[PDB]
Amino acid sequence: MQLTYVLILAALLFCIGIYGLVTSRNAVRVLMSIELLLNAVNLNLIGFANYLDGQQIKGQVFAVFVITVAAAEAAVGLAIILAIYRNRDTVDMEKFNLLK
Amino acid sequence: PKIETRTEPMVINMGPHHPSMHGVLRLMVTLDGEDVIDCEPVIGYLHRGMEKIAENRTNIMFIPYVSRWDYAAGMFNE
Amino acid sequence: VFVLSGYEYFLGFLIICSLVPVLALAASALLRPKSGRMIRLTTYESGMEPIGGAWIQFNVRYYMFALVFVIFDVETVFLYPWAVAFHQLGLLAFIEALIFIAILVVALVYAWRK
Amino acid sequence: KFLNQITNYAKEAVQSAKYIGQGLSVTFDHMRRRPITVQYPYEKLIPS
Amino acid sequence: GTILPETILIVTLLVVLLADLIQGRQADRWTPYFAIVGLGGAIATMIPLWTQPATISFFGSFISDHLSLFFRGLIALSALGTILMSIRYVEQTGSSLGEFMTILLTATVGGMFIAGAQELVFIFVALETLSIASYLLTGYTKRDSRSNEAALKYLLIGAASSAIFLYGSSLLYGLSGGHTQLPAIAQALSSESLGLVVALVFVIAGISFKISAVPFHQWTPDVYEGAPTPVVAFLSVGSKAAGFALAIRFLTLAFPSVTDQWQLIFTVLAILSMILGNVVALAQTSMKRMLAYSSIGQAGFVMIGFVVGTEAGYASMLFYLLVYLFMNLGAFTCVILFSLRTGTDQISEYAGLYQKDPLLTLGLSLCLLSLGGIPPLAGFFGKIYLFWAGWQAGAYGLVLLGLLTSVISIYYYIRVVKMMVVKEPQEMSEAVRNYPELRPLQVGLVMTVIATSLAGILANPLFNLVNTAVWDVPQ
Amino acid sequence: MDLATLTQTITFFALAAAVIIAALGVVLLDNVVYSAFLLGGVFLSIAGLYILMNADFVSAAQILIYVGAVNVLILFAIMLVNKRETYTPVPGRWLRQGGAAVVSLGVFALLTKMILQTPWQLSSVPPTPDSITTIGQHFFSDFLLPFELASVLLLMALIGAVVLARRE
Amino acid sequence: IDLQGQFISALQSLGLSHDLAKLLWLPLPMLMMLIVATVGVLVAVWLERKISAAVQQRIGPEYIGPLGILAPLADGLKLIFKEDVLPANSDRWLFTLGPAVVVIPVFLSYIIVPFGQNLLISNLAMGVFLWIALSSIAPIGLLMAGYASNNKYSLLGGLRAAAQSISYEIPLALAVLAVAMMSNGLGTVEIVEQQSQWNVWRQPIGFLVFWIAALAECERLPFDLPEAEEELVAGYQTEYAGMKFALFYLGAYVNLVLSALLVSVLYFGGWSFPIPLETIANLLGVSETNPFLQIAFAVLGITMTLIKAYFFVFLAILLRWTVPRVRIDQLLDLGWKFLLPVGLVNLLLTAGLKLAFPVAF
Ligand SMILES: CCCCCCCCCCCCCCCCCC(=O)OC[C@H](CO[C@@H]1O[C@H](CO[C@H]2O[C@H](CO)[C@H](O)[C@H](O)[C@H]2O)[C@H](O)[C@H](O)[C@H]1O)OC(=O)CCCCCCCCCCCCCCCCC
Ligand SMILES: CCCCCCCCCCCCCCCCCC(=O)OC[C@H](CO[C@@H]1O[C@H](CO[C@H]2O[C@H](CO)[C@H](O)[C@H](O)[C@H]2O)[C@H](O)[C@H](O)[C@H]1O)OC(=O)CCCCCCCCCCCCCCCCC
Ligand SMILES: CCCCCCCCCCCCCCCC(=O)OC[C@H](CO[C@@H]1O[C@H](CS(=O)(=O)O)[C@@H](O)[C@H](O)[C@H]1O)OC(=O)CCCCCCCCCCCCCCC
Ligand SMILES: CCCCCCCCCCCCCCCCCC(=O)O[C@@H](COC(=O)CCCCCCCCCCCCCCC)COP(=O)(O)OC[C@H](O)CO
C-alpha cells in the first residue's frame, strides 16, 4: 500500500477504459468506459491527497467535483444516446458515419 | 434472458388465473404507454352447458342447478 | 497509514453479512428436491401460454425519473458537508448555500412544469 | 386565479389527513373487540 | 472576497434564470431581448473595472486583469452575435427558444469564467460547464439524424478530451505537493522531469481539442455539418476564445515557462493545422464544412502568435482573435440568411445570387475576402500583424508557410464569390431560380459587415486595447 | 510488520484485483447487462479503495452517485435500447482493435515509467480523520466559485437532458 | 464493566499476542447484531400476522406454537426445503443474485444501530450518511431481478420497483440533513447525545418527511406497489420459489425494524428514560466505575430503545391496514412534488433557526 501502487492502478484503469472507449461497438459501453476513465482520475486525486497533502485535503474536494460532473455528463450522454436511437433505431457505433 | 423493448403497442394477458373474486376472465388488453387501445375479453372458461341440461331435466330436477348462474345471490335465478 | 477509526468492523461485518445469503442459499441447496425440469421451467402467464413477441413498448417514463433523481442525488452530496460544518461557517455561507438551493429549486420547478 | 388553487390544495390536503386519522382511530379501536372467529376444531359451529 | 469581478458574470447568470422562468410561465416569449440586454449589461459592467482598479483576485481562484476582461468581453460579444442569428432559425424549427437561450447563456458563462480562472478545480469546472452546454446545443434539433450523430460524436470526443485533461490536472496537483493554484505550481516545480512533460502533453491534448489544432481537429468537420448553424457561429468564435484564453492563462502562468517544449509542440500543431485545414478545405461542397476546415486553418494562423511569444506575438494573436469575431459572425450570418430563405443547401446552390439578392452577396463576399486577407478589410491587417510578429521573432518557416496557406485559402474563399456574382440568368441554381422576396438577423449582419470592413483601417483605437491586455501575460 | 498493516495490504490488493477483473469485464464481455452490473462492481471496489485511503466521505458520496444513481441510470438506458443485437462484423476491425491495444499498452508503460521514476514528496505526517468538516470548510472559503457554478451546471444539464430525451 | 476490556485482558493473560485478541473479538458483536436482527425479523413477522388479525376481529396463528410464536420459524423452514425453480430462458446468475443484493446492504446498515452507548458495532464517522449511501444498492437488486427473467410481467415490476426506491431517497436524505444540522455531526452516538435533557419536538416536519419516506421504500400497504397482489401478481417476486423468495420475504422486514430503530435514534433517542437520567447523582451512584449502576442503566437504555422501535413497527403495520393504496403516479407525486419541496423547506427552516438561535440547535 504505497503511492506508486495506487498511481499504477489508476493508470491501468485509465488504460482499460481507453481500450473500451475505442474498441467497443455498442453505444452505452463507450459511456461506461468514460466513467472508468473518470474513476481512474479520482483515484489519482485521492492517492495524492492521502499521501502528499494530508492535512488540508484538496484532492478529495476536487474528487467530489469530478464525481458530480461525471454524473452530469452521464445524464447528458444517455440523453444524446436516446435521441440518436429514437431516429436511427440502433446503437451500433459503426453506423453513425455520415461521411466518406 | 430479456424482453427486448420496442416501440409498439404492448399486449398483456390478464389471464384466467385472476387472484381475486372476479371469476375466470382472460382480458387480452393492449396499451400504448399507460393507456388502453383496445381489449378483447375472452369469456367462456366456465361454460358448463346449463342450457343443454335444462332441456333434459324436469323442473324440480333443474331447480338446484339454477343457483349457479350468477353464484351470489342464488335466489334471484331461483 | 490509516487513521479512520471505526473501520475493522465494516470489513468484518461486510464479510459476515455477505456470508448470510451465500450460506442460507447453500443450506437450502443441500436439502431440497432435485430438478423438476420439464414444464416447471416455463414463465407464469396466468396459466395461459406466453403470447409471443414479448416486448415492453419502451417508455421514457423511467429515464426522466432517473435523470431528475441523479440531479438531486448530486445536490444532497453537495449539501451534506455544508450542514455538518454549519458551526464554524456562520453567516455568508448560508447566503451561498441559499443561492445553491435556489438554483436547484428552479431546476425542480423546470422539471415539474414539463 | 392562483390563490383559489392553493386554498383548494390546502382544503384537500387537510381533509386527506383527517380522513386518514379517522381511519387510524377506527382500526386502533377495532382491536379491543372480541374476535368473532369460530375456532373450528375446538369451537365447531352447531348447524341449523 | 472581492466579488466585484463577478458583477460581470452574475448579471448574465441572472438572465439565465430570468429568461428561464419566463419560459416556465409564458412559453411564447420575447426573451431574445433582455438577453441581448443581459449581455450588453455584462459588457458595460467591464468599463468600471477595466482601467479603474488594478488586477484583483477573488480568492486566488479567479483573476480579473485586463487580459481576463478582454477574453470575457470577447466571449460575451460572440454570444451577443449568436443570439441575433438564432431567433428566426430555431423558431422556424419546431422547437423552443428559451430552453435554447438558457443553454447558450450557460455556455457563455462557462467561457467567461474559464478566461479569468487560475485554479485547477475551477478551471475544470468552467471547461466542463462549456463542454456540456456545447453538446446540448449541438444536439438541439433532435429531429434531424445528422444533428444527433454530431452531438454523439462531439460528446464522445469531448468527454475523452476532458478525461485526459483531468488526468493531466491530477498529475500536476500531485507533482507540486498540493497547490491546486496555478501560480503556486510554477513556484513548486521548476525543473523538467518526466512527470512534468506528461502533464504538459496531457493538458495540450485537452486544449487543442478546444482550439481545433490537428490531430485534435477531426470533430469540427463533423460537428459543423451537424449542429444548428448559429450554434456553429458561437462554436467557432466563443469556443476558440475560451480555449486560447485558457491556453494563455495555463501554459504561461502554470507550466513554468522554463519548460517551453510547448512552443515546439505548438509549432508542430500550427504547421500541421496550416497545412491540413487549408488544403483539405479546398475540396468541399457545403458551406458549413468549408467553414469548419477554414476555422481549423485560422486556428493554425493564430497559433503562431503565442508560439513566438514576445509581447508582440501575443498582441498579434489577440488582434486576430478579435477580428476573427467580426469575420466569422458575418460569414455565418449570411450563411444562415441564405439557408433560411429557400436554399437550405451547399455551395453549388449559391450560383446566381447577385441578381436575386445583392445585399447578401455584398455581405458574404466582404467577410470571405476578409477571411482570405484582402486589403483594406479587417483580415488583411490581422494577418499582416500575425506574420510580422512572426518574422520579428525569428520564425521564418512558420510565416513562410502561413503565406502559402493564405494563397491556398484565397483560392477557395474566392471560389464562393465566383458563384455568387458570375452567373447570368441561365446559370442560376435551382435554389435561386425560385428565390423569394428577421430584422435582428439583418441588424446583426449589417453590423458585423461594417465592422469587418472598418476595423482594419480604424485599427489604432483597438491596438492600445490589445496592448494593455498583453501587458498582463507573464514572460 | 503488523496485523493492521497486513490487513491494509491484503485488502488493498484484493480490491485492486476486483477492480482489474471487473473493469476488464466491463469492456470485454459480449453481453451488455453483465457489463452494466460489473460497472457497479467497479464503483463499489473503488469506494472501498477510498475508505482505505482515509477518505470516508468521498467513498460514501461515490456509492451514492456512481453505484446508486449513475449505475441505475445506465441500467435503465441499457434496457431502453434492447433490439436483440444484430451486429454484423465489419472488415476494418482488426486494424482499430490492434491500434487501440498497442496504444493502450504503450500509454500504460509510459505512465508506469513516469510514476516509478518521479520522486514524490511523501510528507510523512498522519492525515486528518475529520475529513468531511474540512471539505465543508473548503466549499465556502477556497472552492466557492466551483461550488456555486456546479448548481448552474446541474441546472443546464437537467434542462438540456429533458429537452433531448423529451417525447414529441 | 467494558466487556471488551475484560475479554481482551483475560485472553491476553494466556499470551495470544494482545493485538491478535482485538481481532479475536470482532465476531462477538458482529454476530450479536446478527442475532438481534434475526430476532427482530421474527418479531416483525409475528407482529404483522397477529396485529392484522386483531385489527380485523380475528385470530392469527395459534396452532403452530403456544401463541403462533413458532409461525415465522415454520414459514422460514418451509421455504428452506422448497424446490427452487429457474425458468426456461431466464439468466442463471443475476437470478440467484437479485435477492442477495437486495439483502446484503440492508444487513450491513446495522453497524450504526446504537442500542445504548458503547453497545453498538463501531460508531462510525459517516454513520447515517453511510446508511443513506447503502440504501441505494437495493434498486440494483430489483433491476437485477427484473432483467434476469423471461417474464415481461416481472420486468415491468422490477422497473416500477426500482423507480419507487429512487423516488424516496432524496427526501429521506433531506430529513437526515436537517437532523445532522442540529446533531453537529453524522455518527449515531453523536447524533443522539444531543438529547441530554428529542429532535421530534424541534423537527416536527422533518420527522413526518423521514417517516413517510421510510414507509415508502417499497415496504408498506400505503404503497407496497411491487407487492400489490390485485393490480399485478407479486411483481418481480412472481418467479422465486425457495430460499430465493425467502430472501425477499426477509429483506423487507429487516428493512422495517431498521427504519423503526433509525427513527427512534434520530428523532427520539435510544437512551433517556424521559427524565435526564445520568443526573441520578441523587442516589449518589458513582456511574464512572459503578460495577452495577452500569448494568442497570444498560438495561434501561435497551428497553427505552426497544419501546420506541416497537412503537414505529406497530404504527407501520397498523397503517398497512388503514391507508388505501395509490396507483403508481399518485405515489411518484409524493416524492418530487410534495416530499421533496417540504424536505427542502424543512432544511432551510432548520438552517434559519440554527443561524438565528444557535442555542437549542
Ligand atoms: C430476539 C430478540 C431478543 C433476543 C435476546 C438476545 C439474545 C441474548 C440473550 C442473553 C440475555 C442475557 C443477558 C442479560 C442482560 C443483562 C446484560 C446487560 O444488560 O449488560 C449491560 C452492559 C453495559 O455495558 C456498559 O455500560 C456502561 C454504563 O451503561 C451505559 O449504557 C448506556 C450508555 O450511556 C446508558 O446511557 C447508561 O446511562 C450508560 O451508563 C458503560 O456504558 C460501559 O461502557 C458499557 O460497557 O453491556 C452488556 O454487557 C450487554 C451485552 C449483551 C447484550 C444482551 C442484552 C439482552 C437484553 C436483556 C435485557 C433484559 C431486560 C430485563 C430482564 C429482566 C426482565 C425485567
Ligand atoms: C476458534 C473458532 C472461533 C470461531 C468464532 C465463532 C464462534 C462464535 C462465538 C460464540 C457466539 C456468541 C455470539 C454472541 C455472544 C455475545 C457477545 C457480546 O455480548 O458482545 C457484546 C457486544 C459488543 O459491544 C459492547 O461494547 C462496549 C465496549 O465499547 C466498544 O464496543 C464496541 C466495539 O468496540 C463499540 O465500538 C464501542 O463503541 C466500543 O467503544 C461494551 O461495554 C462492551 O464492552 C462491548 O462488548 O454488544 C454489542 O455489540 C451491542 C449489540 C448487542 C446489543 C444488544 C441489544 C440487544 C437487543 C435486544 C434483545 C431483544 C431483541 C428482540 C427484539 C428485537 C426487535 C427489534
Ligand atoms: C445433530 C445433527 C446431526 C445431523 C444434522 C443434519 C441437519 C441437516 C441435514 C439432515 C440430515 C439429512 C441431510 C441430508 C441432505 C439431504 O437432503 O439428502 C437428501 C435426502 C432426500 O432423500 C433422498 O432424496 C433423494 C432425491 S431428492 O433429491 O431428495 O428428491 C434421493 O436421491 C435419496 O435416495 C433420498 O433418500 O434428504 C435428507 O437427507 C434430509 C433432507 C431434509 C432433512 C431436513 C432436516 C431438518 C433439520 C432442520 C431443523 C433442525 C433445527 C436446527 C438444528 C441445528
Ligand atoms: C458497500 C459495499 C462495500 C463497499 C466497500 C467495501 C470495502 C471494504 C472496506 C475496506 C475497509 C478498510 C480497511 C480496514 C482496516 C483494517 C485495519 C484497521 O482498521 O486498523 C484498526 C485495527 O485493525 C484490526 O485490528 C483489524 C484487523 C482484523 C480485521 C480482519 C477482518 C475480520 C474477519 C472476520 C473475523 C474473523 C476472526 C477469526 C479468524 C481466525 C485500527 O484500530 P481502531 O479503529 O481502534 O483505531 C485505534 C487503534 O485501535 C489503535 O490506535
Author numbering:
A (entry chain E): 1 to 100
B (entry chain H): 2 to 79
C (entry chain C): 13 to 126
D (entry chain I): 2 to 49
E (entry chain B): 13 to 449, 457 to 494
F (entry chain G): 1 to 168
G (entry chain A): 5 to 201, 207 to 370
Excerpt from the paper describing this PDB structure:
Cyanobacteria express instead the inducible NDH-1MS (NDH-13) and constitutive NDH-1MS’ (NDH-14) photosynthetic complex I isoforms that convert CO2 into HCO3− by kinetically shifting the reaction equilibrium towards bicarbonate, against high cytoplasmic HCO3− concentrations.
The catalytic site responsible for the CO2 chemistry in the 50 kDa CupA protein electrostatically binds NdhF3. CupA has a fold, comprising α-helices, which drastically differs from known carbonic anhydrases (CAs) in which the catalytic zinc (Zn2+) ion binds to histidine (αCA family) or histidine/cysteine residues (βCA family) at the interface of β-sheets. CupA is capped by the 16 kDa α-helical CupS subunit that binds two helical lobes of the former, and could help in stabilising the CupA-NdhF3 interaction. The active site of CupA shows a strong electron density that we assign to a Zn2+ ion, as also supported by inductively-coupled plasma optical emission spectrometry (ICP-OES), which indicates a protein-to-zinc ratio of ~0.7 in the NDH-1MS sample. The Zn2+ ion is coordinated by His130, a putative water/hydroxide ligand or carbonate, and Arg135. The Zn2+-site is located at the interface of two 12 Å helices, and CupA forms further contacts with NdhF3 and several lipid molecules. A non-polar tunnel starting from NdhF3 that leads to the Zn2+-site via this Arg37/Glu114/Tyr41 network could function as a CO2 conduction channel from the luminal side across the membrane. Remarkably, NdhF3 binds a chlorophyll a/β-carotene motif that connects via His469 of NdhF3 in a TM-helix to the CupA site.
